[PDB]
Coordinates of C-alpha atoms and ligand atoms in Angstrom, one line a residue:
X558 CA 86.5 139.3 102.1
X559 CA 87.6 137.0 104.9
X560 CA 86.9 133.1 104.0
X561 CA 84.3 131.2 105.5
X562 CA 85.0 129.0 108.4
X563 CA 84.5 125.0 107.7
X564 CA 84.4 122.0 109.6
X565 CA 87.2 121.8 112.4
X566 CA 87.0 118.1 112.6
X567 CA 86.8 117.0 109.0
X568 CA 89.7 115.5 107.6
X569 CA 89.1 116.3 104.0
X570 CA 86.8 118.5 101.7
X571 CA 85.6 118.7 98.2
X572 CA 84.2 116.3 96.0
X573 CA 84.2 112.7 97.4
X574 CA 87.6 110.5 96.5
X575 CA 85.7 107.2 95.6
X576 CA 83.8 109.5 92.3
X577 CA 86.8 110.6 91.1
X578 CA 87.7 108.8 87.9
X579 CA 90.5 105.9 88.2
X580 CA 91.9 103.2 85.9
X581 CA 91.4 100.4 85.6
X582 CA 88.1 101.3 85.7
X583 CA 88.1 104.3 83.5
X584 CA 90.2 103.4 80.8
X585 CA 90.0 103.5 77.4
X586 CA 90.2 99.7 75.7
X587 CA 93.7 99.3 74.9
X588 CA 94.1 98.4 71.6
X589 CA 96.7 95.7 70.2
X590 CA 99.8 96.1 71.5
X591 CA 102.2 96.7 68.3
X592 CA 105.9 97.7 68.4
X593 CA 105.8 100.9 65.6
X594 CA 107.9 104.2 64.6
X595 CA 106.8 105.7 68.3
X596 CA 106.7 102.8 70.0
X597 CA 109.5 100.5 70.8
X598 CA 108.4 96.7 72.6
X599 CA 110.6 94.4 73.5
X600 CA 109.0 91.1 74.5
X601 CA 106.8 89.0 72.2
X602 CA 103.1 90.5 72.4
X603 CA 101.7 87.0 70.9
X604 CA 103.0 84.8 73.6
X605 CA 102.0 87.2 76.3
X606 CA 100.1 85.8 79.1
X607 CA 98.9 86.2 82.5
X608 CA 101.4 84.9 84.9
X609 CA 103.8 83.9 82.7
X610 CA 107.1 85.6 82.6
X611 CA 107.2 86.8 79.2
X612 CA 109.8 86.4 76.2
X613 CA 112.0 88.4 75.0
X614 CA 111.5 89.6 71.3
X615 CA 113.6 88.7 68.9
X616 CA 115.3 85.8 70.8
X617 CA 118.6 86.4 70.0
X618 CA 121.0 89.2 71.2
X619 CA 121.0 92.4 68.4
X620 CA 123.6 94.7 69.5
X621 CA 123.8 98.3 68.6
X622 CA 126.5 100.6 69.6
X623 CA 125.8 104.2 68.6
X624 CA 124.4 107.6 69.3
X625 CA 120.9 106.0 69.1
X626 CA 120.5 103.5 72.0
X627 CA 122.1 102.2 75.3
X628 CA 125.2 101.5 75.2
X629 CA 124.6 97.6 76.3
X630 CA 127.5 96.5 78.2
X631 CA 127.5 93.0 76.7
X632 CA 128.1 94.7 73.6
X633 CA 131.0 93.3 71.3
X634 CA 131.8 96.9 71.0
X635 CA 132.4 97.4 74.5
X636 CA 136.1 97.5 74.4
X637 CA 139.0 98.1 76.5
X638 CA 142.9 98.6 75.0
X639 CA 145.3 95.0 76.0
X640 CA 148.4 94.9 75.5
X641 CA 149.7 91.3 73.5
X642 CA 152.9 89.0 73.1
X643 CA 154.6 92.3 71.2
X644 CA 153.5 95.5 73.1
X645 CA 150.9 96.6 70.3
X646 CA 147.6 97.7 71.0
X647 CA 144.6 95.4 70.9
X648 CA 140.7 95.6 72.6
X649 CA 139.5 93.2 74.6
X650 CA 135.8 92.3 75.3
X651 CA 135.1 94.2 78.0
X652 CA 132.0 92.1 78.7
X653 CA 134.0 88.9 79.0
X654 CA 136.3 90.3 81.3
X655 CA 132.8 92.0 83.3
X656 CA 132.2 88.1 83.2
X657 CA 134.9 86.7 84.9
X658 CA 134.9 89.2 87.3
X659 CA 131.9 88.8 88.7
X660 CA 131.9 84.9 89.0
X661 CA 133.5 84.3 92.3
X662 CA 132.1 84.3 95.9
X663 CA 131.9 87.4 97.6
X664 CA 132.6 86.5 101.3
X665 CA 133.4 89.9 102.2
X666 CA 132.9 93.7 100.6
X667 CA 136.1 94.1 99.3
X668 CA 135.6 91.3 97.3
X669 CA 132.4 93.1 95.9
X670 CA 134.6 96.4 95.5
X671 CA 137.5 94.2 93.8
X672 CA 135.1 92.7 91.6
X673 CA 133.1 96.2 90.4
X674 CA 136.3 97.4 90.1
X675 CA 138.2 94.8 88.0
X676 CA 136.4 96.6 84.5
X677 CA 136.0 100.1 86.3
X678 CA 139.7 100.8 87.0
X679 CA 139.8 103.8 85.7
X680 CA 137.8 104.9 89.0
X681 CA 139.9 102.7 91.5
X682 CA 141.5 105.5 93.1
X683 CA 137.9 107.3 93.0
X684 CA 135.2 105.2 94.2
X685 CA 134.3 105.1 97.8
X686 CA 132.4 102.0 99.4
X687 CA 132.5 103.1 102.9
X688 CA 128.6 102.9 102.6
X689 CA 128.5 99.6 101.5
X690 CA 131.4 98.2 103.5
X691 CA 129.6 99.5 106.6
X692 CA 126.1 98.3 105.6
X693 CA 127.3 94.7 104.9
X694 CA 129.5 94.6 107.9
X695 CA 128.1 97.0 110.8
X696 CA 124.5 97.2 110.0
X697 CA 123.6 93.5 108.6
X698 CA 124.2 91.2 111.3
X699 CA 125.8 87.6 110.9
X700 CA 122.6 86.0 109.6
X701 CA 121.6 89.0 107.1
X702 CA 124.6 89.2 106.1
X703 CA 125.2 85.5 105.3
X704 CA 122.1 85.6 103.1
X705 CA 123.3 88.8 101.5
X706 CA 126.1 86.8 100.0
X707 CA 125.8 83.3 99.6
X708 CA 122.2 84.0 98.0
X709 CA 121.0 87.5 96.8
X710 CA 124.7 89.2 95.0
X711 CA 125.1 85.4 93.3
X712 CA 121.0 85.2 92.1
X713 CA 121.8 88.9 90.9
X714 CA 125.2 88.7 89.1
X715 CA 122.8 85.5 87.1
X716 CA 120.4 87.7 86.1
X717 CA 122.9 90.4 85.6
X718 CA 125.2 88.1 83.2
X719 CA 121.8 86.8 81.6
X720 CA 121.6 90.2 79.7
X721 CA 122.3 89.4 75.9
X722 CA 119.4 86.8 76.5
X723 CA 116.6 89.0 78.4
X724 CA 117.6 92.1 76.7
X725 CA 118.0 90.9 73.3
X726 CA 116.0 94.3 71.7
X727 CA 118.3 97.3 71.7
X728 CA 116.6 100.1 74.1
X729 CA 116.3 103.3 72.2
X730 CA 117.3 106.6 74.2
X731 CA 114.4 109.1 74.4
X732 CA 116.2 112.1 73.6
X733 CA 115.1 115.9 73.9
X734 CA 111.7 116.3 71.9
X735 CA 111.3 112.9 70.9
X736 CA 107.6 111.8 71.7
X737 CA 108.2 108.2 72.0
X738 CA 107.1 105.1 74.1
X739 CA 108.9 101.9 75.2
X740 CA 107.5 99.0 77.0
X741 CA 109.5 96.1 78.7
X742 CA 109.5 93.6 80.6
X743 CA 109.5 93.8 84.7
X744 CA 112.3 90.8 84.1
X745 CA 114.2 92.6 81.8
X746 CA 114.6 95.9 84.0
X747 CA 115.4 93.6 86.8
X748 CA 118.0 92.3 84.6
X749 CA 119.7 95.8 83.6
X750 CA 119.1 96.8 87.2
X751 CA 121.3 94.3 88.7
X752 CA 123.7 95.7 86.0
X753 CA 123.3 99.2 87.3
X754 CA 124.2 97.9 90.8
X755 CA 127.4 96.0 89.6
X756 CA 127.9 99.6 87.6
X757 CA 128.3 97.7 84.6
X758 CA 127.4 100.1 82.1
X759 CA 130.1 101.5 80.2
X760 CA 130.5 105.8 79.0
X761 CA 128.6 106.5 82.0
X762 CA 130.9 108.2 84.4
X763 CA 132.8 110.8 82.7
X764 CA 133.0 113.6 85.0
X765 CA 133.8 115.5 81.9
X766 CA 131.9 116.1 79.5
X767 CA 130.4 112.8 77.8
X768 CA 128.3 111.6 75.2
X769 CA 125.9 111.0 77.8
X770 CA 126.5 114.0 80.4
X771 CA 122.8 115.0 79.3
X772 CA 121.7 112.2 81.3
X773 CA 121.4 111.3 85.0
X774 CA 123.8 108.5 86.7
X775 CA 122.8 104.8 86.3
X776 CA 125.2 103.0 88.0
X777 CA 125.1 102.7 91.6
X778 CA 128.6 103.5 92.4
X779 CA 127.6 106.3 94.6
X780 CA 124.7 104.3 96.6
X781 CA 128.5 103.0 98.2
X782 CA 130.4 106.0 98.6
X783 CA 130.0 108.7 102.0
X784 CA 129.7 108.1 105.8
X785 CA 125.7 109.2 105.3
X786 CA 123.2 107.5 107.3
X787 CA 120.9 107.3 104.8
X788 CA 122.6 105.3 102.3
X789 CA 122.0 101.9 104.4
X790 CA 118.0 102.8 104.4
X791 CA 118.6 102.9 100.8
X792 CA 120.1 99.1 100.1
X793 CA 117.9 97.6 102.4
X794 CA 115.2 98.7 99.9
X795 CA 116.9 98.0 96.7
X796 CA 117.5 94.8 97.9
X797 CA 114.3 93.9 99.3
X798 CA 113.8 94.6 95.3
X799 CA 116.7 92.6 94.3
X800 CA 115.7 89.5 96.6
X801 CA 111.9 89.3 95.3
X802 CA 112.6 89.3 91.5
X803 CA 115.6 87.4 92.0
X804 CA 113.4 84.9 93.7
X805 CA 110.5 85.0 91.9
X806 CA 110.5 85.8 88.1
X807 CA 108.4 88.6 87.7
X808 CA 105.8 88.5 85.1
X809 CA 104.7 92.1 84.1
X810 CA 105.4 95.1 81.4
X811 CA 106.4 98.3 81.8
X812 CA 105.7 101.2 79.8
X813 CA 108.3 104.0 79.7
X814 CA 106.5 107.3 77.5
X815 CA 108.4 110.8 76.4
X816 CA 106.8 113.8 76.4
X817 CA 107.2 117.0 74.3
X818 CA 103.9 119.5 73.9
X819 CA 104.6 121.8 71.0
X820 CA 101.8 124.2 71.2
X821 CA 100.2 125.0 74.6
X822 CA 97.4 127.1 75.5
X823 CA 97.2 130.8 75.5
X824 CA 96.3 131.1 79.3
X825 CA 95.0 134.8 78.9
X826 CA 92.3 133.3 76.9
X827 CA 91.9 129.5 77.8
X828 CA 88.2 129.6 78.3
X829 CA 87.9 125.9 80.2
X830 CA 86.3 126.0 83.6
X831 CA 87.7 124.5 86.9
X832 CA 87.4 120.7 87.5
X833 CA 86.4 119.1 91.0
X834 CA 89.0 119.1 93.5
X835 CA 89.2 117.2 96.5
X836 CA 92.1 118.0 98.8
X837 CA 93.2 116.3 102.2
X838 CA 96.5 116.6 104.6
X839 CA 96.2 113.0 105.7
X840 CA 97.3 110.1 103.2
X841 CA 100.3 110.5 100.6
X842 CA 99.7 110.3 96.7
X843 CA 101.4 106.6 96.5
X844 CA 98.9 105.5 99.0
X845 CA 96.0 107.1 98.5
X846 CA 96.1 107.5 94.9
X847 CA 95.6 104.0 93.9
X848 CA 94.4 103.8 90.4
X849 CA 94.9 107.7 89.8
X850 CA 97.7 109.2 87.8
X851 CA 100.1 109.7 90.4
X852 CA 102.7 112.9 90.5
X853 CA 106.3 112.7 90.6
X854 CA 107.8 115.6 91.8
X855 CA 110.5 115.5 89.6
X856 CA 114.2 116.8 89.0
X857 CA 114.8 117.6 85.1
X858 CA 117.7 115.0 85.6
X859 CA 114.9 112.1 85.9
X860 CA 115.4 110.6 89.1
X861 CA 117.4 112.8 91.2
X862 CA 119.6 111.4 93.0
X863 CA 118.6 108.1 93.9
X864 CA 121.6 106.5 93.2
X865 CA 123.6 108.4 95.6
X866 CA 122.4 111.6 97.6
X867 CA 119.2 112.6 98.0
X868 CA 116.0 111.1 99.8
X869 CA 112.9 113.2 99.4
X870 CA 109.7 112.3 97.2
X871 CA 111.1 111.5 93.9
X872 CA 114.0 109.5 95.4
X873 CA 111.9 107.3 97.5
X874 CA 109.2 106.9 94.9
X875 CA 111.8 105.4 92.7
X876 CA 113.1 103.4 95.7
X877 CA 109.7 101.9 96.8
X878 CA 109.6 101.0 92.9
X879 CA 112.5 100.4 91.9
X880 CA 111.4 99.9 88.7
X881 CA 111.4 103.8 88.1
X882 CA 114.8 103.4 87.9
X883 CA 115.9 102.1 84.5
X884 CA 114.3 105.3 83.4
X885 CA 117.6 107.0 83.9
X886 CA 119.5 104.6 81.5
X887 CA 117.5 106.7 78.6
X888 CA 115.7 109.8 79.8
X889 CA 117.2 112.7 78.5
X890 CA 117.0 115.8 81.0
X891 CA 113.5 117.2 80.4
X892 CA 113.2 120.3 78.7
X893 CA 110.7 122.8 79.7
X894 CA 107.9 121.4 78.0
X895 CA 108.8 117.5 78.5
X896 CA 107.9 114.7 80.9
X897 CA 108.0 111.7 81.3
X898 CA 104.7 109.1 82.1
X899 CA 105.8 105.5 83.3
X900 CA 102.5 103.4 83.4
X901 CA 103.2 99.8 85.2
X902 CA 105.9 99.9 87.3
X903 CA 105.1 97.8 90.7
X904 CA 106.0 98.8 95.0
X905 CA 108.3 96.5 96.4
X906 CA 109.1 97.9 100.0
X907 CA 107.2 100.6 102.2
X908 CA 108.5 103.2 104.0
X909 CA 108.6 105.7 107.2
X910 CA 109.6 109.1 107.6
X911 CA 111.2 111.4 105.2
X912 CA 114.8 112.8 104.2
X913 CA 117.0 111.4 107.5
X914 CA 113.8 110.4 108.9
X915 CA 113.7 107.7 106.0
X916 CA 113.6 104.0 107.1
X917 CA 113.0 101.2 105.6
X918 CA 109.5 100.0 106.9
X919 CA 108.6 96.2 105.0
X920 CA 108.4 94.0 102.0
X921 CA 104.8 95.2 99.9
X922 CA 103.5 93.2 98.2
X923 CA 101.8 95.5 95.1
X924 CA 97.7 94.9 95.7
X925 CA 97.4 96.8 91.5
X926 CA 95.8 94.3 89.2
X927 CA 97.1 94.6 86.2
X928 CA 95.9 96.0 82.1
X929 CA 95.1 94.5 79.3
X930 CA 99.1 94.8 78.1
X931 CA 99.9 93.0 81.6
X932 CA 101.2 96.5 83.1
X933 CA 100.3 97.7 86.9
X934 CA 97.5 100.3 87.0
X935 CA 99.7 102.3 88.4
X936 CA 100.8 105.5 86.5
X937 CA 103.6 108.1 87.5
X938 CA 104.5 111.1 85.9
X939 CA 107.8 112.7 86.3
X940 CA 107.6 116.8 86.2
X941 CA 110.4 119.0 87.3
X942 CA 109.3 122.3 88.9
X943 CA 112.2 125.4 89.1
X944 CA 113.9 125.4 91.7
X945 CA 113.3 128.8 93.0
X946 CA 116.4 130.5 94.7
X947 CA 114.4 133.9 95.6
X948 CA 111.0 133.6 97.1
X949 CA 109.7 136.5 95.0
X950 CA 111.0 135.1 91.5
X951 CA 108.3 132.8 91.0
X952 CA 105.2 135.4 90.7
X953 CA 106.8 136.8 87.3
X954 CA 104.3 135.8 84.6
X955 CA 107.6 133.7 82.9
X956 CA 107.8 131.5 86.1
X957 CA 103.9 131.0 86.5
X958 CA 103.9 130.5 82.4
X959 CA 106.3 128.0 82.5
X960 CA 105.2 126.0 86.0
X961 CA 101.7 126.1 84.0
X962 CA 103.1 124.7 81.1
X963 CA 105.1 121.5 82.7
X964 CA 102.0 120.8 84.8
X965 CA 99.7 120.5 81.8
X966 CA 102.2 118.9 79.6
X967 CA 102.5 116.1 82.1
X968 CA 98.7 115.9 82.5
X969 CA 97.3 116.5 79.1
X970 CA 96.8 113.3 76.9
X971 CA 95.8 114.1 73.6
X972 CA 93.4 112.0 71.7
X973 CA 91.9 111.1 74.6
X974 CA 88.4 112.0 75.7
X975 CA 88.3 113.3 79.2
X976 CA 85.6 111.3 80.8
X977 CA 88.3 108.4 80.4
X978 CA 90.7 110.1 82.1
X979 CA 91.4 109.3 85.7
X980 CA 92.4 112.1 88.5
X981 CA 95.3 113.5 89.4
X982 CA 96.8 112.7 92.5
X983 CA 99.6 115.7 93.7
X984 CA 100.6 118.0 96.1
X985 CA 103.0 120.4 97.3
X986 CA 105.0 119.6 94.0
X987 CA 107.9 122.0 94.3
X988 CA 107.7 123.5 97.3
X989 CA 110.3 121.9 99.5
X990 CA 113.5 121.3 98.2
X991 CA 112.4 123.7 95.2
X992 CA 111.6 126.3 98.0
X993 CA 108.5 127.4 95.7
X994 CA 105.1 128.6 97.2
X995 CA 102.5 125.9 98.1
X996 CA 99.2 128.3 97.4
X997 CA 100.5 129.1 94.0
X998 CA 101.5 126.0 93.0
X999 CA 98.4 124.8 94.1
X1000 CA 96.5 127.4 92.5
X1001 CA 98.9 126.8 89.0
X1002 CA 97.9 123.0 88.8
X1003 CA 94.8 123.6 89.7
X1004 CA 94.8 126.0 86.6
X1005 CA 96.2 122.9 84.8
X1006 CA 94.4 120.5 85.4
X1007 CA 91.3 122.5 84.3
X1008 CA 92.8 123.2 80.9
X1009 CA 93.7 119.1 80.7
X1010 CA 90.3 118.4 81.8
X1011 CA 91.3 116.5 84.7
X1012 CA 89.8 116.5 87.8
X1013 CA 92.6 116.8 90.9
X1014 CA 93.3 115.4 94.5
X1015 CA 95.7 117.4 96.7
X1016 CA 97.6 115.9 99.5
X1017 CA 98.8 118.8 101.6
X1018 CA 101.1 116.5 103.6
X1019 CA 100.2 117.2 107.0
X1020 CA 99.4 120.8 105.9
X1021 CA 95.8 121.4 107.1
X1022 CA 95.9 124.9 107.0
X1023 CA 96.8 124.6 103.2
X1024 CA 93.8 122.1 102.7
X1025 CA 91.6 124.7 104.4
X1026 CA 93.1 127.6 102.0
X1027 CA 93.4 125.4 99.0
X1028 CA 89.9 124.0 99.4
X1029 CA 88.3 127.8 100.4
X1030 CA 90.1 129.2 97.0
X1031 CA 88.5 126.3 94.6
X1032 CA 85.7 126.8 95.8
X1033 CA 85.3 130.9 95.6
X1034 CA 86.9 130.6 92.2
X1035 CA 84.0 128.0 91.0
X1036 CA 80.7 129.7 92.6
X1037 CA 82.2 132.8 91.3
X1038 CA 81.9 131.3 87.6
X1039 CA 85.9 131.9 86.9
X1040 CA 87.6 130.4 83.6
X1041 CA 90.9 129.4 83.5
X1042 CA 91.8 132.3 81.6
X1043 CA 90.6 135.0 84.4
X1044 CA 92.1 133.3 87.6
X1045 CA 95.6 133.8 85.1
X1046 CA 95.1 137.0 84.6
X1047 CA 95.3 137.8 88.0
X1048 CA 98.2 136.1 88.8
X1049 CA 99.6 138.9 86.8
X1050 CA 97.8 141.1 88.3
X1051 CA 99.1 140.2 91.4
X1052 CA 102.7 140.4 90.2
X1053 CA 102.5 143.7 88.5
X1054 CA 100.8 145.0 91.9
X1055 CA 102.9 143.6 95.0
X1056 CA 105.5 141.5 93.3
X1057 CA 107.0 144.0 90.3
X1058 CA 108.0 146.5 92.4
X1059 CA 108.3 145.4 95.9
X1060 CA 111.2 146.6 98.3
X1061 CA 111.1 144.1 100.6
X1062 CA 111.9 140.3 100.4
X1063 CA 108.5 139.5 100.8
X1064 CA 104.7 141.4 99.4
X1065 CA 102.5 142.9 101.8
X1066 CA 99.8 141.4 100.5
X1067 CA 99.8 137.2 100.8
X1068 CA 98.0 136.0 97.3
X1069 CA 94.7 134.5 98.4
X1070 CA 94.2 137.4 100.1
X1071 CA 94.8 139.8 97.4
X1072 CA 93.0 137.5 94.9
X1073 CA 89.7 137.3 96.9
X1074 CA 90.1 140.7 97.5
X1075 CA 90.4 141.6 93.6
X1076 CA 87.8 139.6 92.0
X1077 CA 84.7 140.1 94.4
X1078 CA 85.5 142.4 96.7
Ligands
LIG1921 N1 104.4 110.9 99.2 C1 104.0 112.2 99.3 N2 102.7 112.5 99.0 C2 102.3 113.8 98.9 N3 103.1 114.8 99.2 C3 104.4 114.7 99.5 C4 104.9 113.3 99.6 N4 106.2 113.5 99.9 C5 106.5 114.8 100.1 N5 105.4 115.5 99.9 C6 105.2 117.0 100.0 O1 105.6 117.7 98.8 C7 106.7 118.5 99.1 C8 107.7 118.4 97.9 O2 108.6 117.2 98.0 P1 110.0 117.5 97.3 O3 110.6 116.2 96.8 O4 110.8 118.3 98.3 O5 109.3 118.2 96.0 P2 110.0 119.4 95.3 O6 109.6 119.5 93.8 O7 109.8 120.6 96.2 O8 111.6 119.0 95.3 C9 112.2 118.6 94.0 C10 113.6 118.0 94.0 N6 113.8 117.1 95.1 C11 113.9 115.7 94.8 C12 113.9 115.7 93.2 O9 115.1 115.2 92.7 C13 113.8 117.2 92.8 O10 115.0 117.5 92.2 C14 107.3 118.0 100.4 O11 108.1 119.0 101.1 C15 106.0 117.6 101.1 O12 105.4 118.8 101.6

């Protein structure tokens, strides 16, 4: 069985985007939004309005210092040793001394560095701020540079010192197989942000192993560091961030939700049919897939490295919305069975290119009108894929079983009936940097999806050849009546029979091939 040839013009095929299902419009009537055992809120839900920025519940700063939450940095626990009149040991308020620090002008770097540094000593002789030294003086000209200073690191070291004040809830962490929620204020996150850029936060830099070394960096101490080229494509969009809630107040919430499916579905058995599938290689998931839930493609270590080294789709999702970011101040590493769904965070900037291709393209100014809890309609998910070191590895039933599993635990959402529940907009999730196969991966979520009862939307990227594939696949699977369970079994099918015991680096037998091949042929 060779595939059928389709339209050589067409730029996408399957079931029309605009009736795919998308929030707002799809949703599910949020109900009251009440703070509870699962769900942490920290702004006052009664005096929340439209427009207006909203405020902090409870008003006054409640610290906690423990194995529980974030380690605030204005904590009165945050300590350093001082030596007094005698020689004996005291601890000083590492906060004040944060404080005083940060309030002077900054009329070149090094005063920046000095400053950052002044609580950080311990990384004097560590730190590197090439990046930023260059970026303020070589790449911002006179005038940027002038506004960079005078204005933006001033209206962020406010907001940054305003902590105890914005942040007065403490922020839980969401720890390995906790399934818990927290919602915040856009205001708030800008406000820890600005900490993370003045790498304020303290236990979170140990390269030895920490309290924290199951979580990914925070502070941006390494967004400085390296003669990279990237880096200074990097600030300009953190900053075009920092300048526009610096500026203007912002006046949404942000929801951050954990995770952790228990029980998953016997795949050998899962009798759920396909869903619709409509799958392009022009537009990206962040543009196109307004209103849809929107893919990640994730590093267990939430994030990646966006505070430092890399610049592929995870990094510059969270650097086009910045508010992504905070997730790393209390996201665990994910598990195999855990993600992490952030519903309201906003685009500041857009973008051009990819990896070194990256620049930084404009302000955006975010077009999603926002819920009933005064969130975006905008929902990511972060899920990690493996990161495949030998082509082959991936076809063993443990690697598809597990991809499988990821994929539906970041689409599933119980309780919820599926006619509510929007699309999901992906693509070649794990097959660049991961190294992993596009067709299967296709093929897995695809499975996924089906057993979450969500319809999908595949951007191939440029990739016509794989929409072609992709969509010819879907589309023999479906008039060929296949459940879930079926097209699974033949995965391993196709392992035990090319894959198991294969000399080469590489089957004979390419898998849509073999699969048409094997069910109707
Ligand atoms: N905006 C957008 N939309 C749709 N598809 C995209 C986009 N950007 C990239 N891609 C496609 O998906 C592929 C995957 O991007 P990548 O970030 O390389 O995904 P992986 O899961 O393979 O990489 C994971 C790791 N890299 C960064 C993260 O920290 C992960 O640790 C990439 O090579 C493209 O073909």
């Amino acid at each position: 069985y060779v595939p059928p040839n389709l339209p050589p013009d067409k730029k996408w095929l399957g079931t029309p985007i605009e009736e795919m299902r998308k929030m707002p419009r799809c949703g599910v009537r949020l109900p009251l939004l009440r703070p509870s055992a699962s769900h942490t809120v920290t702004v006052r839900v009664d005096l929340l309005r439209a427009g207006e920025v909203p405020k902090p519940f409870p008003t006054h700063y409640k610290d906690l210092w423990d194995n529980k939450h974030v380690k605030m940095p204005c904590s009165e626990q945050n300590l350093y040793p001082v030596e007094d009149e005698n020689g004996e040991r005291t601890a000083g308020s590492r906060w004040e001394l944060i404080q005083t620090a940060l309030l002077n002008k900054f009329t070149r770097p090094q005063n920046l560095k000095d400053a950052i540094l002044k609580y950080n000593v311990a990384y004097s002789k560590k730190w590197d701020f090439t990046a930023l030294v260059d970026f303020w003086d070589k790449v911002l000209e006179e005038a940027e540079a002038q506004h960079l200073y005078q204005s933006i690191l001033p209206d962020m070291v406010k907001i940054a010192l305003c902590l105890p004040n914005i942040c007065t809830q403490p922020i839980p962490l969401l720890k390995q197989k906790m399934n818990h929620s927290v919602t915040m204020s856009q205001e708030q996150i800008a406000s820890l942000l600005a900490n993370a850029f003045f790498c304020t936060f303290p236990r979170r830099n140990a390269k030895m192993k920490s309290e924290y070394s199951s979580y990914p960096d925070i502070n941006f101490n390494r967004l400085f560091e390296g003669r990279s080229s990237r880096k200074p494509e990097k600030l300009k969009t953190l900053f075009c961030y920092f300048r526009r809630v610096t500026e203007k107040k912002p006046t949404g919430l942000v929801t951050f939700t954990r995770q952790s499916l228990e029980d998953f579905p016997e795949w050998e058995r899962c009798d759920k049919p396909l869903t619709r599938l409509h799958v392009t290689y022009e537009g990206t998931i962040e543009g196109n897939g307004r209103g849809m839930l929107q893919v990640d493609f994730a590093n267990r270590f939430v994030g990646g490295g966006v505070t430092g080294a890399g610049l592929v789709q995870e990094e510059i999702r969270f650097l086009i919305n910045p508010e992504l970011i905070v997730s790393r101040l209390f996201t665990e590493v994910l598990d195999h069975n855990e993600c992490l769904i952030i519903t309201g965070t906003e685009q500041y900037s857009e973008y051009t290119g990819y990896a070194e291709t990256y620049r930084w393209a404009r302000s955006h100014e975010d077009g999603s009108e926002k819920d009933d809890w005064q969130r975006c309609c905008t929902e990511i998910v972060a899920i990690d894929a493996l990161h495949f070191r030998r082509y082959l590895d991936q076809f063993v039933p443990e690697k598809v079983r597990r991809e499988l599993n990821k994929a539906y635990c970041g689409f599933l959402r119980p309780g919820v009936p599926p006619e509510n529940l929007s699309a999901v907009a992906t693509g070649n999730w794990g097959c660049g940097a991961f190294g992993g196969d596009a067709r299967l991966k296709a093929l897995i979520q695809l499975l996924a999806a089906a057993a979450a009862e969500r319809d999908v939307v595949y951007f191939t990227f440029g990739d016509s050849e794989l929409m072609r594939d992709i969509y010819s696949m879907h589309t023999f699977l479906t008039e060929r009546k296949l459940n879930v369970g079926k097209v699974y079994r033949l995965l391993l099918r196709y392992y035990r029979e090319e894959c198991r015991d294969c000399s080469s680096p590489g089957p004979d037998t390419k898998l849509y091939p073999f699969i048409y091949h094997a069910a109707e042929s």
